Each structure stands twice: as C-alpha cells, then as structure tokens.
Structure 1
C-alpha cells in the first residue's frame, strides 16, 4: 500500500543502506503492520525483510 516507513526502519535496524533493504513483495500486508521497529526485528528474524548483499566489485 505504502511502505517508506518500513524501508527506513529496516535500514536503521539492519544498519545498512535502504538500497540494501529488501522487502518480500509478496508478504506486504504483514510488513505494513510494522508501524514500529522491534516489530521489524521480528520480521527480519522471520525472513520477510532482508539485507541484500553488496553489489560486487571485484579486484580480480
């Protein structure tokens, strides 16, 4: 529906970008009732929101 709150909070909870934040686009409703963090922390342990990896930049 609208999630920017939940992408911020995620970011500051992971301590990553927000680029790096990924939200499971299927399980959205569950995400949209994460009006706090700690709520999000739950969602991170359950595997809906997730920290992406770094975009590789090899030195090879």
Structure 2
C-alpha cells in the first residue's frame, strides 16, 4: 500500500542507507500496521 515511512525508520535504526533494507513482500499488511519504532525493533527480533 505505502511503506516508504517504514523503510525510512528502518534505515535510521540500523544506521545505514535504506538502499540496503530488505523487506518481506509477503507480509505487507503486517508491516503496514507498524507506525512505531519499538514495534519495529520487535519486527527485527522477529526476523522479517
């Protein structure tokens, strides 16, 4: 739907360019409902 925000935050967390971030295309609707940094740190530990 729209995930540029999440890519941006992911890059700020990992301290790299968003050029390197790989997301799972399948769990799109699951990512879209993130909207927050701790919740992303949760997805990192989860491994998506």
Cα separation, 1, equivalents of 2:6 and 2:15: 14
Cα separation, 1, equivalents of 2:16 and 2:47: 16
Query: For the pair shown, which has the larger CA radius of gyration, 1 or 2?
Result: 1
Give the alignment's TM-score, normalised by structure 2.
0.90
Cα separation, 2, equivalents of 1:16 and 1:38: 18
Q: Which has the higher helix share?
A: 2
Give the alignment's TM-score, normalised by structure 1.
0.74
Cα separation, 2, equivalents of 1:10 and 1:21: 7
* 4+ aligned runs moved over 6 Å, structure 1: none
Cα RMSD of the aligned pairs, angstroms, is 0.8
| Structure 1: unaligned runs, 5 residues or longer | 49-60
Residues matched between the structures, number: 48
